[PDB]
Amino acid sequence: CFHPPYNNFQPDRRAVKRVGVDTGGGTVGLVASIYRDSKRKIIRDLQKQDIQYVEYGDTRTLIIPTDKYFMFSSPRLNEICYPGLNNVIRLLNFYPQSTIYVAGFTDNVGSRSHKRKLSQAQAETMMTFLWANGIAAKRLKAEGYGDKNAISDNAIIHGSAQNRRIEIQWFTS
Amino acid sequence: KIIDEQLNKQARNLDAIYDFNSLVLEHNILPPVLLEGRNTLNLADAQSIRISDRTYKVAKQAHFITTPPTWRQYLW
Amino acid sequence: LNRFRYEGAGVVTGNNLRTSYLDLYLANEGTTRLAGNIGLQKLEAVGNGVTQINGVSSRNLQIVLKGDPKVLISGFVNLRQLDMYGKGTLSLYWIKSDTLTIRAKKAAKIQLAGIVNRLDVELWDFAQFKGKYLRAQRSFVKTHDKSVAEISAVNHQSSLATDASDIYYYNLSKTRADFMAFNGSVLDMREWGQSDLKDFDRYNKQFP
Amino acid sequence: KFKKPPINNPSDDATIKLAEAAVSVSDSMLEMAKVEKVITPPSKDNTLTIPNAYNLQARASVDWSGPIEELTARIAKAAHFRFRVLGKSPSVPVLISISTKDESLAEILRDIDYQAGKKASIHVYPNSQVVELRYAK
Amino acid sequence: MKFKKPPINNPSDDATIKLAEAAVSVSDSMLEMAKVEKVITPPSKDNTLTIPNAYNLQARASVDWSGPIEELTARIAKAAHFRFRVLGKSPSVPVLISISTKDESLAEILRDIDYQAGKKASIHVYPNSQVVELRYAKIY
Amino acid sequence: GKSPSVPVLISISTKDESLAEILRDIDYQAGKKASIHVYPNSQVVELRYAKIY
Amino acid sequence: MYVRTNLTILSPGWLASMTSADGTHAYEMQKSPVLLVSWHGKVMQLKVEGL
Amino acid sequence: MYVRTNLTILSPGWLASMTSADGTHAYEMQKSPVLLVSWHGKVMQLKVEGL
Amino acid sequence: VPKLPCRVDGACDATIIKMMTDLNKKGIKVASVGQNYLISIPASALFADQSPRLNWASYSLLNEIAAFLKQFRKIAITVTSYSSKYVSVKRERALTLARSRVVSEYLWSQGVDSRIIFTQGLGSDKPITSYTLGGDRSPNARVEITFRRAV
Amino acid sequence: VPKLPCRVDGACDATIIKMMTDLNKKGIKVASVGQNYLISIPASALFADQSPRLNWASYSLLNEIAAFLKQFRKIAITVTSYSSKYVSVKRERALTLARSRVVSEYLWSQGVDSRIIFTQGLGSDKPITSYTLGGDRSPNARVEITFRRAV
Amino acid sequence: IIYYIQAVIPGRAWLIGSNGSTLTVREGSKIPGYGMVKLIDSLQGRILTSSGQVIKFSQ
C-alpha cells in the first residue's frame, strides 16, 4: 500500500515489495533495488524530472522550478510532483550532518516588497516541508530574494522564465 | 483565424490589463490623450541647432463618452 | 545563603529574600510559599506538591520534573528549555527570553505568556500546551497522537500533526504552514465578532 | 485515485507573465482608487436617521415625481402628524421623485432628505407629533 | 548524459509574447504613477470605519463579475440574510464593475466594490439593524 | 550632468593594461566632452559631462 | 438603429436612451453588425443580421 | 526615412533625433537602403529593402 | 441554424439521467424540484475522522460532481456544511468552514461556469435526525450544494 | 532568405555538447546554468610546481578550450586564478596574477570574438575545498573563467 | 507618547512604551497621558483608558 500524500510522512519501503514481486530471485530483486535506489540512478531520475543538481567540490546545489513545482501565483504547492519530492527526500537522506541554506528567486516585474513577500513565503514553505520529515530546525536557514541576481536576462521571455528559481545549497562541514 | 481564436482564449486578462472605466472622470468624460518627448534635437539646416529637454503634446482633446471603450475596437 | 534542600513532609514559608543564586531542592510534599525577590539560576522539585513563588529575576534557569508538581511563579525569567514527563502543572506569568525548546511526553499543563524570538515544541501523547498570549516570531509545533496545542504565533508558523491532534492558533501569522498525516487538525479559532479583525491576505492564504 | 489539474492552468510562461502583470495592474489600480477615495465619517454625517415613532412603522406604496410639499403633507396625514413649514420656497421649487412598493415612512423621509441634499431638510418630533420642513436661506 | 534546463513547458505564441511585453511596461507605468500619487497626497482614513465587519459576514465567496451592481449586492444581501436598501437616484449612465477574486470575506468584498465604485456611489452597513444600503452620487 | 543629444563615441582597443591607465586614456579621448573622477576611500567612480551651450 | 430590450448596451455607444416603468430600455444610435451586452455579470455578443 | 529602434545609428547622418524615457530612439533622415550601428561595442551593418 | 448552434455544449439528457441514476446508486443524494437542485454528500466518502483532510480517493468523486456541474448553466452556487457536536461549537464550526472553503476552492479551480460561489458551514446547529448514535458515521454530518438553474 | 544566413557561422550544437562531454570526461569542469557558464581547470595539469611556466602538451588542451569558446557569442570573459598556501600571501597573489595574465594573453592571441577580457588572481584567499592536504595538487589550486551567453 | 501591549493576562497587563518605558500596570491604576485605565480584555487585545481611548497591540 502507498499514499500519494507523502505516505503520511512515513518512511518509504520499495525494496520489500520489489523482492516480493521478484520472488513471485529475491537476491536478484535486492541487487536490482540497490542498483535502482543508488545515487547515480536517483540523480538520473531527478534529471529525467525537471530538477537541476550541481556538485562542485564540497558545496552542493539543487535548483527547483517554481512555475512547475508550485501552485501558480501562490505559496501553495503543486501536488503532482510528489514523486520528485520523494526523490528529493531520498537523495537528501544521504547527508545527515550538512548545514543547509535555502533561497528563492523571482523575476523583475512587480513591487519589490511584493516580490520579497512572495519569495519569503515560498522559501518558508519549502523550509517547513523539509522540516516535516523530521530534520532539526537549526540545520537550515531560509531566505527569499527578489531580483537581486538571476542566471538569465529578464528581457528575453524564456530567460525571464528561467529567472525564478529555488536554490538549495549545502556544505559538508 | 488562429490569432483571433488565440485572442479570444484569454478574454478576462484583456479586461484586467485594460480598464478605461477606472480612468473615466466623474462627469462621464474620457481623459485626453498626451504624448511625451525627452532630449529632442533638431538640425533644421546649417548655422542653426535647436535643442530641447522635454516636450509634451495634447493629441486628442477630452470629450464625452456614452460607454467606456474596449480592446475589441483596437485589437480584434 | 546559598542552598536549601528540603525533604520529609513540611511547609516552608518566607518573604523578602534577595539572592544572586541559591540551589533549591524540594521533595516529599514541600509546601513552599515564597514572597521574595529571588534571583537564582537553578531550581529543582520532584513532584506531588505545590509551590507558589512570587518574584523571580533569573538570567538563566532550567527545570526538569519527574513527579506531578503544581508550580506557579511570578517575576521575569529568561528561560532556555523545558522537558516534561509526568503530570506536571506549571504557570509562569512573564517570560522575556529568546529561544525555547519544549518536550512533552505524558501530561503537562503549562500557562505561558510573553515574548519569544524562536520556539519549538514536541508533543507525544496526552500533552496539553495552552501557550495562548505567548508571542513567538518563529513557531515550530510537532505533535504526535492525542496532543493539544494552543499557539499565538505572530509572523512565521510551522505545524505538523500525525493523528487525532488539535492545534489551534489565535493570531494571524504573516506566513503559515501546516500539515496533517492521518487525523491531525489545525484551526483558526477566532471570534468572528471583532470590529477590526483582519482576514486572509494574498500571501498567507494557504488553503488547508 | 486520480487527481486532475485545473483546466485554465497558466502552462505557458508568457501566460504566466501576462497573468502576473494583470495582478500587478489590478493591485496598482486598487491602490490608486484607495488613495483617491473620499470617505465621509459615519458619525457626524449630516443625514437624519430613523426617529422610530410608532406612526412611522407603516408600509405603503408611493409613486411620485415632482414637488415635495403636498407629498409630505400626505405623509403627515397618513402618519396623523401635524406639519409646519420654516422658510420660503424659491422661484424653482423642489423637483424630486420616489417610486417604491413597500417602504416605511422613516427611511422614506430619509431618502427624501437625501434627495433634498443641502437647500432643504426636515425634522421629526415624535414627542409632540409634528414634522417640520426647513428651507435654507 | 543529457543536459536540461528546468524551465520547460508548452510552446508559446508570438502575439502572447507581444501582449506580455506591452503589459509589463503598462504595469510599470501604473506602479510609478501610483507611487507618485501616494507621495503627492497622503491617505486620511479607511472605509472599514464606515463599514465594519460583524458576525455572519464571514461566509466566504469566490466571485467573478463584469456587470452592474444592484443585482450583485442583492445576491450578497440575500446570502447574508440582510435587509437591502437603495438610496438616491440611479444615473442614466450605468455603472459597470469587474471583480475576480477567490474565497474572501464579504465585508472586504463590499469594501473593494466601494473602492472600484469611487465617487459614483458609496456603501453603508448598519449591522445592528442588519441593513446594507447603497447610496448613489447626488450629482448633475 | 544630463546625457547630451549628440552621442559621445569612444573607440579604444588595446591589450593587457591596468584600469587606471585605461580610464586616463578614456578621459583623454573625451578631452573637452567629459571628465572622470575616482574617490577610492569612498570607492566611488563618477563621470561628469561638460556643462556647455 | 433603434433597439428595444431589457439588457445593457456596451460596445458602440448609444446616442439617446429611455427607460420604461418596467425598467426595460430603449437605445438609439448608428449602425453596426455586432453588439455587446452584460447579461448577468457575464459578457455576451450579438449579431445584427439584415443590416 | 523615419526609424524607431533602441540602438544607436552611426553612419548616414540624421535630420532630427528624438528619445524616450525607456531607451527608445527615433530618427528622421534622408532615404537610404543601408545603415550602420554599434550594437554592444561591436559595429554592424543593416540592409533595408522596399525603398 | 447551419451556423447558429442547435444546443448548448456537451448536452445529452440521457447522460444527465444516467449519471443521476449512477450517483443515486452510489449513495450521494440528488434533489430536483422546479428550478432548484440540491446535492447532499455524506462526510464518510469525503473527509477523515473529524479532520479537514482529504483522502486520495475522493478526487474521482470530486471530478464526477464537477462533471455533473459542468452540464448546466447557473449564476450562484452555495455549499453548506453540517457536522456533529464533538467538544465545543467553535471547533466544528471552524471545521465545517474549512471543509467548505477547500471544496469551494477546488470547485472554483475547476472550470464549472458560475459567477458566485458561496461557501459556509454551520457546524452542527441544524440537525436533520435525532438518531445521533454515530459521530462522523451519523448521517447528520454532511455537505450539500444548492443552485437554481437559470433559463 | 537565400541571401541571409540560416545560422551563425561555424556553429553546431551537436559538436558543442559532444566536446563538452569530452571536457567533463577529461575532468576539466564545465558548469552550465541559465545563460551563464563557468570553466574550471586544475592547475597541476597546466603549470609547473609553484611556477608561471607552461608544459608544451598543455597547448593542445588550450587549443581545444579556445575551439569550444569559438562556438559562442560573448561580450566579456572573466579570468581568475587560485592556488594553495606555499610561502607567503603576496607570492601566491603574484603567481596567480601571472598565470591568469599568460592564459589571457594566449586566449586573446587565438581568435575568439570577445570584446572585454578581465583577468585577476587571488592566491589562496577563497578555497573551494576544506581538505587541504595537498600542495599544488590540491583542487583549490585552479583557474576559472566565467561568462554569460549573449542571446 | 504612545505605548503598546507585549504580554496580556486576564487581570494584569504587561505594557512597554514606545521609548521602552516598561509598566507592570494594574487594572485599577493611573497611566501617563491617559489618566486611569477602565477595562482589560484578553481574548481581544483592547485596554480602555479613563481618558477615553482603546490601546492595542502594534502593527
For every residue of F24-38, DSSP letters joined together read HHHHHHHTTSEEEEE
DSSP I70: T
Whole-number Cα distances in Å, D122 to A46, D49, D69: 78, 11, 11
Task: List residues bridging with H35 in a β-sheet.
Answer: H46
- Interchain contact, H19 vs B40, CB within 8 Å: yes
Give all chains having 3 or more CB-to-CB distances under 8 Å with chain I. A, C, D, E, G
Question: What's the distance, CA C21 to chain centroid?
Answer: 23
Helices (H) and strands (E) in chain B, counts: 3, 4
C-alpha D78/C-alpha K16 separation (Å) is 62
Q: Check CB contact under 8 Å for I119 and E62.
A: yes
d(CA C153, CA K12): 21
| Cell digits of residue J93 | 597573489
Q: Amino acid identity, residue J147?
A: F
Q: Which helix (H) or strand (E) element contains residue I66?
A: helix I58-69
**F4, three cell numbers:** 547630451
Distance CA A77, CA J12 (A): 39
Q: Of C141, E43, A61, give the one whose Cα is nearest residue J128.
A: A61
N-term to C-term CA, chain C: 56
Cα distances (angstroms) measured from residue G8 to each of B42, D89, E67: 51, 39, 9
Chain E touched by B36 (CB under 8 Å): no
D38: distance to nearest CA of chain A, Å? 25
Return the C-alpha cell found at E53: 465587519
Residue A169 CB neighbours (<10 A): 14
Q: How many residues does chain D have?
A: 137
Cα–Cα distance measured from residue J77 to residue J35, given in angstroms and rounded to the nearest whole number: 14
What are the backbone dihedrals phi and psi of residue J119, each rounded to the nearest 5 degrees, phi first?
-145, 140
Please enumerate in sequence order all residues whose Cβ is within 8 A of that of J9, keeping only pairs 6 or more positions apart, or say none: none
- The 10 Å CB-count burial string (b at 16+, else e) for I88-122 is eebbbbbbbbbbbbbbbbbbbbbebebbbbbbbbb
Task: Report the DSSP beta bridge partners of residue J145.
Answer: J39, J79
User: Which residues are within 8 A (CB) of D49 and not within 5 positions of it... i.e. 6 or more apart?
Assistant: D110
Cell reading at J85: 598556501
Q: Is E26 on the interface with B (CB under 8 A)?
A: yes
The answer to whether F5 contacts chain H (CB < 8 Å) is yes
Q: How far apart are CA C154 and CA C174, in angstroms?
A: 7
Q: Determine whether the interchain pair C179/A8 forms a contact, defined as Cβ–Cβ distance below 8 Å.
A: no
Chains D and I touch (3+ CB pairs under 8 A): yes
Q: Which three cell numbers stand for residue A15?
A: 525494496
CB pairs below 8 Å between G and I: how many?
6
Decide if E102 touches A, using CB distance below 8 A: no
- Beta-sheet strand order (sheet of K35-40): K30-31, K35-40, K47-49, K54-55
Cell of I120: 459556509
Instruction: Identify whether the C-beta of residue D51 lies closer than 8 Å to the C-beta of residue D100.
Output: no
DSSP helix/strand/coil, E46: coil
Q: Which residues of K touch C (CB under 8 A)?
A: 6-9, 12, 14, 42-44
CA A1/CA K34 separation, integer angstroms: 66
User: Could you tell me the sign of the dihedral formed by the alpha carbons of H23, H29, H32, H35, in that order?
Assistant: negative
Q: The sheet that has H2-5: what strands, in order across it?
A: B48-60, B33-45, H16-19, H25-28, H2-5
Q: Which residues are G47's β-sheet partners?
A: G34
HSE-up of residue J58 (Cα within 13 Å, Cβ side) = 15
Angle at A26 between CA A21 and CA A31, to 5 degrees: 105
Task: Tell whether J108 is within 8 A of chain F (Cβ).
Answer: yes
The span from the first CA to the last CA of chain D, in angstroms, equals 78
Residues of I with CB under 8 A from a CB of A: 56
Partners of J119 in beta bridges:
J79
I53/C187 Cβ within 8 A = no
Please give the C-alpha separations between residue I52 and each of A126, C145, F48, I146, K11, in angstroms, as whole numbers: 22, 16, 65, 21, 36
Judging contact as 3 or more Cβ pairs under 8 Å, the answer for G and F is: no
Say what the alpha-carbon torsion angle C9, C15, C20, C23 is, to the nearest 10 degrees: 0
Cβ contact B–E (≥3 pairs, < 8 Å): yes
C-alpha cell at K22: 516598561
Residue ranges of J 59-78 with Cβ closer than 8 A to chain H: 75
Q: Which residues contact J25 (CB under 8 A, 6 or more apart)?
A: none
- What span, in angstroms and rounded, lies between the C-alpha atoms of C69 and C67? 6
Q: Give A15→chain D minimum CA distance, Å.
A: 23
| 3-state class (DSSP) for residue D33 | helix
Residue C120 near residue C140 (C-beta atoms within 8 A): yes
Helices then strands, each counted (H, E), chain C: 0, 19
**Regarding beta strands C70-77 and C50-53, do their DSSP bridges make them parallel or antiparallel, or are they unpaired?**
parallel
Helix extents (H) in chain J:
13-25, 58-69, 90-109
Give, as one character, the DSSP assignment of residue E92. S
Residues ≥6 apart with Cβ < 8 Å to A117? C203
Smallest CA–CA distance, residue B54 to chain G, in Å, is 37
SS3 letters for I30-60?
A: EEEECCEEEEEEECCCCEECCEEEECCCHHH
Residue of A nearest to I54 (CA): A5
Q: Which amino acid, one-letter code, is at C47?
A: G
d(CA A119, CA A75): 9
Strand-pair partners of C156: C138, C175
Pick from G16, G37, G39, G12: which is nearest to G26 by CA? G16
- Backbone φ and ψ for H44, nearest 5 degrees, come out as -135, 160
I6 — phi, psi (to 5°)? -85, -35
β-sheet bridge partners, residue A53: A62
Spatial CA neighbour of D18 closest among A97, K57, B6: B6
Tell me how far apart the alpha carbons of residues E87 and E81 are, in angstroms, rounded to a whole number.
19
A72 vs C115: CA distance, rounded Å: 35
Phi, psi of B27, rounded to the nearest 5 degrees? -105, 30
* Three cell numbers, residue C141: 509545533
Note whether E54 contacts C196, CB cutoff 8 Å. no
Residues of chain J contacting residue H45, judged by C-beta atoms under 8 Å apart: none
For residues C119 and C81, is the Cβ–Cβ distance under 8 A? Answer: no
Give CA–CA dist B55/B40, Å, rounded.
8
I93, containing H or E segment: helix I90-109
CB–CB contact J35 A152 (8 Å): yes
The DSSP code sequence of C24-37 is EEE-SSEEEEEES-
D34 contacts in E (CB within 8 Å)? Answer: 43, 115
Q: How far is F49 from chain H (nearest CA, A)?
A: 18
- What are the start-end ranges of the H helices in A70-136? 82-92, 112-131
Half-sphere exposure (Cβ direction) of H16: Cα atoms closer than 13 Å = 14
Please tell me which residue of chain E has the smallest CA distance to B3.
Answer: E15
User: C-alpha grid cell for residue J35?
Assistant: 545563460
Neighbour tally for H12: CB within 10 Å: 14
- Distance of alpha carbon B28 from alpha carbon C202, whole angstroms: 33
What residues in K contact C133, CB-CB < 8 Å? 7-9, 42
Inter-chain CB pairs, C–I, below 8 Å: 34
Cα of F18 to nearest chain H Cα, Å: 20
Q: What SS3 class is residue E84? A: strand
**Interchain proximity B67–G11, CB inside 8 Å:** yes
What is d(CA F29, CA D25) in angstroms, rounded to the nearest whole number? 46
User: What's the resolution in A?
Assistant: 4.6
Would you state the cell numbers that stand for residue K55, as one nine-digit string?
490601546
> What sign has the CA pseudo-torsion K51, E45, D27, C193?
positive
Identify the helix (H) or strand (E) that includes residue K26.
Answer: strand K22-26
Nearest CA in chain I to D10: I109
Which of I4, B45, D27, J33 lies closest to A63 in space, CA to CA? J33
Q: Look-up: residue for cell 466571485?
A: E63
Beta strands F34-39 and I76-82, pairing class: unpaired
Phi, psi of E19 (to 5 degrees): -65, -40
Question: Are the CB atoms for J58 and J46 separated by under 8 Å?
Answer: yes
- CA atoms J54, J60, J64, J66: torsion sign: positive
Give which of I47, I51, I54, I56 to mutate to test A binding, by max A Cβ within 10 Å: I56
Instruction: Provide the residue type at J90 as one letter.
Output: K
Report how far residue E10's alpha carbon sits from residue D13's, in angstroms, rounded to the nearest whole number. Answer: 8
Set of chain I residues whose Cβ sits within 8 Å of the Cβ of C187:
91, 94-95, 98
For residues H39 and H8, give the distance between their C-alpha atoms in angstroms, rounded to a whole number: 7
Q: How far is CA A161 from CA A154, A158, D15, in A?
A: 8, 5, 11
Residue type, A149: N
CA–CA separation, C60 vs F22, rounded Å? 61
Which residues from chain D sit within 8 angstroms of residue E125, using beta carbons? Answer: none
Amino acid letter for position B31:
P
- Which of D65, D115, D114, D105 lies closest to D83 in space, CA to CA? D105
Instruction: Count CB-CB contacts under 10 A for residue B71.
Output: 15
J76-82 and J116-121 beta bridge pairing? parallel
Closest alpha carbon within chain E to G36: E67
Instruction: Give the one of B12, B17, B66 whose C-beta lies nearest to E26's C-beta.
Output: B17
Of E123, I43, H43, B54, residue with least CA distance to D40: E123
CB pairs under 8 A between B and D: 16
CB contact under 8 A, D35 and E41: yes
Residue B34: strand, helix, or coil? strand
Q: Does E34 contact D at CB distance below 8 Å? A: yes
* Residue A138 DSSP symbol: G
DSSP letters of E64-77? Answer: EE-S-SHHHHHHHH
| CB-neighbour burial class of residue F32 (10 A; exposed 0-12, middle 13-18, buried 19+) | exposed
For residues E64 and E70, what is the distance between their CA atoms, to the nearest angstrom?
A: 15
Pick left, alpha or beta for residue D79 (phi over 0 → left; psi -120 to 50 → alpha; otherwise beta): alpha
Nearest-by-Cβ selection for A67 from E5, E7, E20: E7
Residue reference for cell 467606456: B68
B42: Cα separation from own chain's centroid: 25
G40 contact residues in E (CB cutoff 8 A): 67, 71
Rounded to an integer, what distance in angstroms lies between the CA atom of residue I98 and that of residue K48? 34
Q: CA-CA distance, E79 to E12, in Å (whole number)? A: 42
Judged by CB atoms closer than 8 Å, whether chains meet at B66 and G14 is answered as yes
**Which residues on I lie below 8 Å from D2 (Cβ)?**
59-60, 63
Contact status, residue C132 vs residue C113, Cβ threshold 8 Å = yes
Of I56, I57, I111, nearest to D8 by CB-CB distance is I111
CA atoms of C37 and C52, how far apart (whole Å): 13
